[PDB]
Structures are given as structure tokens and as C-alpha cells.
Enzyme design. Structure first.
Site, PDB file in Angstrom:
ATOM      1  N   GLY A  86      34.245  -5.706 -22.247  1.00 14.32           N
ATOM      2  CA  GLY A  86      33.589  -6.889 -21.725  1.00 14.32           C
ATOM      3  C   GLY A  86      33.526  -6.727 -20.219  1.00 14.32           C
ATOM      4  O   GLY A  86      32.932  -7.528 -19.498  1.00 14.32           O
ATOM      5  N   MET A  87      34.157  -5.640 -19.774  1.00 16.66           N
ATOM      6  CA  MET A  87      34.218  -5.274 -18.368  1.00 16.66           C
ATOM      7  C   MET A  87      32.967  -5.717 -17.635  1.00 16.66           C
ATOM      8  O   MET A  87      33.030  -6.265 -16.535  1.00 16.66           O
ATOM      9  CB  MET A  87      34.364  -3.753 -18.259  1.00 16.66           C
ATOM     10  CG  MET A  87      33.054  -3.045 -18.634  1.00 16.66           C
ATOM     11  SD  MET A  87      32.528  -3.561 -20.287  1.00 16.66           S
ATOM     12  CE  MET A  87      30.981  -2.622 -20.335  1.00 16.66           C
ATOM     13  N   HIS A  88      31.837  -5.466 -18.267  1.00 12.11           N
ATOM     14  CA  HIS A  88      30.546  -5.820 -17.717  1.00 12.11           C
ATOM     15  C   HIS A  88      30.644  -7.056 -16.830  1.00 12.11           C
ATOM     16  O   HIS A  88      30.508  -6.962 -15.611  1.00 12.11           O
ATOM     17  CB  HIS A  88      29.604  -6.058 -18.882  1.00 12.11           C
ATOM     18  CG  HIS A  88      28.323  -6.682 -18.398  1.00 12.11           C
ATOM     19  ND1 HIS A  88      27.737  -6.327 -17.194  1.00 12.11           N
ATOM     20  CD2 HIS A  88      27.506  -7.640 -18.945  1.00 12.11           C
ATOM     21  CE1 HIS A  88      26.617  -7.059 -17.056  1.00 12.11           C
ATOM     22  NE2 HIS A  88      26.429  -7.877 -18.096  1.00 12.11           N
ATOM     23  N   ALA A  89      30.894  -8.208 -17.441  1.00 13.47           N
ATOM     24  CA  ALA A  89      31.021  -9.444 -16.674  1.00 13.47           C
ATOM     25  C   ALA A  89      30.935 -10.679 -17.573  1.00 13.47           C
ATOM     26  O   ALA A  89      31.946 -11.314 -17.869  1.00 13.47           O
ATOM     27  CB  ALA A  89      29.923  -9.512 -15.604  1.00 13.47           C
ATOM     28  N   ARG A  90      29.713 -11.024 -17.975  1.00 17.99           N
ATOM     29  CA  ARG A  90      29.470 -12.201 -18.812  1.00 17.99           C
ATOM     30  C   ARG A  90      30.710 -12.618 -19.619  1.00 17.99           C
ATOM     31  O   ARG A  90      31.224 -13.720 -19.428  1.00 17.99           O
ATOM     32  CB  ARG A  90      28.261 -11.944 -19.735  1.00 17.99           C
ATOM     33  CG  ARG A  90      28.306 -12.847 -20.981  1.00 17.99           C
ATOM     34  CD  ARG A  90      28.256 -14.320 -20.566  1.00 17.99           C
ATOM     35  NE  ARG A  90      26.971 -14.635 -19.955  1.00 17.99           N
ATOM     36  CZ  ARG A  90      26.573 -15.895 -19.813  1.00 17.99           C
ATOM     37  NH1 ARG A  90      27.335 -16.870 -20.225  1.00 17.99           N
ATOM     38  NH2 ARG A  90      25.418 -16.157 -19.262  1.00 17.99           N
TER      39      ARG A  90
END
Length: 85
Positions: free
Chosen positions: A14-18
Site C-alpha cells: 500500500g506503500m503507494h499512498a492512498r
């Protein structure tokens, strides 16, 4: 009782962000201090997007989730399902 777990990414903690950012915006829903770090030595306090960018390099590593507050489980457990994808 605090909660902490090590989630092995498949390539997206989920590192991405959202999602990882939901912890924060959702933290407003769960009272808990979720802490995100990589067994690599990378540490990110669920709230420091900058820190989350750090584990971004994750891709295969393993994260150590740690939440602490009334709803630290739902929070860490919500990311997990996300960390677990």
C-alpha cells in the site's frame, strides 16, 4: 494491548499512498498510532508520507506494522488486509 505485525509485501504494501494514507485519514476513524517500518531498518510512522515513500523501495521486503490506541487493531488490521492486499 498494542498491535504489531510483519507484513511481507508481494510488491505493494500500500506503500503507494492512498491506502497507506488511509491509515492517517482513517486514523481519524481509528484512535491508534500505526507504525510502518521495514525489517530492512526503514521506519515510518503512519502519517509521515515521506517515511512511507522510504519503504516504497519495499518491493519484496517485509514491513513491520505497529499500532497503538483504542482501534489500533482495526487500523493495523485494515492496512494489513491492504498490506496483504
Amino acid at each position: 494491548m498494542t498491535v504489531k505485525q510483519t507484513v511481507e509485501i508481494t510488491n505493494k504494501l500500500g506503500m503507494h499512498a492512498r491506502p497507506a494514507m488511509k491509515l492517517f485519514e482513517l486514523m481519524q476513524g481509528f484512535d491508534a498510532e500505526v507504525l510502518l517500518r521495514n525489517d530492512e531498518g526503514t521506519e515510518a510512522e503512519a502519517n509521515s508520507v515521506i517515511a512511507l515513500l522510504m519503504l516504497d523501495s519495499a518491493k519484496g521486503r517485509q514491513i513491520e506494522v505497529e499500532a497503538t490506541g483504542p482501534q489500533e487493531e482495526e487500523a493495523l488490521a485494515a492496512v494489513i488486509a491492504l498490506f496483504n492486499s
